C-alpha cells in the first residue's frame, strides 16, 4: 500500500525533471490538439492519448495507487509519440530525450519506494 503523499513526494521530482527539459518537453506539456496543430489523423493512430499535464493532475489528485501506474502513463505518452511521429521529426527525437531522462530519474525512486 502506498499513501497519496508518499507517491507524490517520490514521483513529482521525476515529472519535474521532464518539465525541465527545454525544448524537449514542449510538445508534451498539454494534450495533443489535432485540429489546432493541423494533424487531423492523430486520433486515428493514437487511441489512448497522454501528456505531462494529465499525469501531473493525476498525481495531484490521488489517481495513482501504485508507482507503476504512473510509470505506465509516462511510457504511454512516449509510445504514442514514437508511434505517431516520424523518426526524423522534432517530436520523436524530443520523446527519445525525455525517455532517457525519465529512465535515469525513475530508477533510484523505484528503489526507494520498494
Ligand atoms: C506529442 C505529439 O505526438 N504531438 C503530435 C505532433 C505534434 C505535437 C506538437 N507540439 C504540441 C504543441 C507544443 C509543441 C511545441 C514545440 C516547440 C515549441 N518550441 N520549440 C523549440 C519546440 C514543438 C516542436 F518540437 F515541434 C511541437 C509541439 N507539434 N506536432 C507536430 C504538428 C506540426 O509540427 C509538429 C504534439
Swiss-Prot record:
Residue segments, region Interaction with histone: 41-87
Record note on modification: Methylation of the KIX domain by CARM1 blocks association with CREB. This results in the blockade of CREB signaling, and in activation of apoptotic response. Sumoylation negatively regulates transcriptional activity via the recruitment of DAAX.
Top-level taxon of the source organism: Eukaryota
Cellular compartment(s): Cytoplasm; Nucleus
Start and end residues of each Bromo domain: 2-109
Region: Interaction with ASF1A, residue numbers: 79-97
Quaternary context: Part of a complex composed of MSX3, CREBBP/CBP AND EP300/p300; the interaction with MSX3 decreases histone acetylation activity. Interacts with DHX9 (via N-terminus); this interaction mediates association with RNA polymerase II holoenzyme and stimulates CREB-dependent transcriptional activation. Interacts (via transactivation domain and C-terminus) with PCNA; the interaction occurs on chromatin in UV-irradiated damaged cells. Found in a complex containing NCOA2; NCOA3; IKKA; IKKB and IKBKG. Probably part of a complex with HIF1A and EP300. The TAZ-type 1 domain interacts with HIF1A.
Role, per record: Acetylates histones, giving a specific tag for transcriptional activation. Mediates acetylation of histone H3 at 'Lys-18' and 'Lys-27' (H3K18ac and H3K27ac, respectively). Also acetylates non-histone proteins, like DDX21, FBL, IRF2, MAFG, NCOA3, POLR1E/PAF53 and FOXO1. Binds specifically to phosphorylated CREB and enhances its transcriptional activity toward cAMP-responsive genes. Acts as a coactivator of ALX1. Acts as a circadian transcriptional coactivator which enhances the activity of the circadian transcriptional activators: NPAS2-BMAL1 and CLOCK-BMAL1 heterodimers.
Protein name per the record: Histone lysine acetyltransferase CREBBP
Organism: Mus musculus (Mouse)
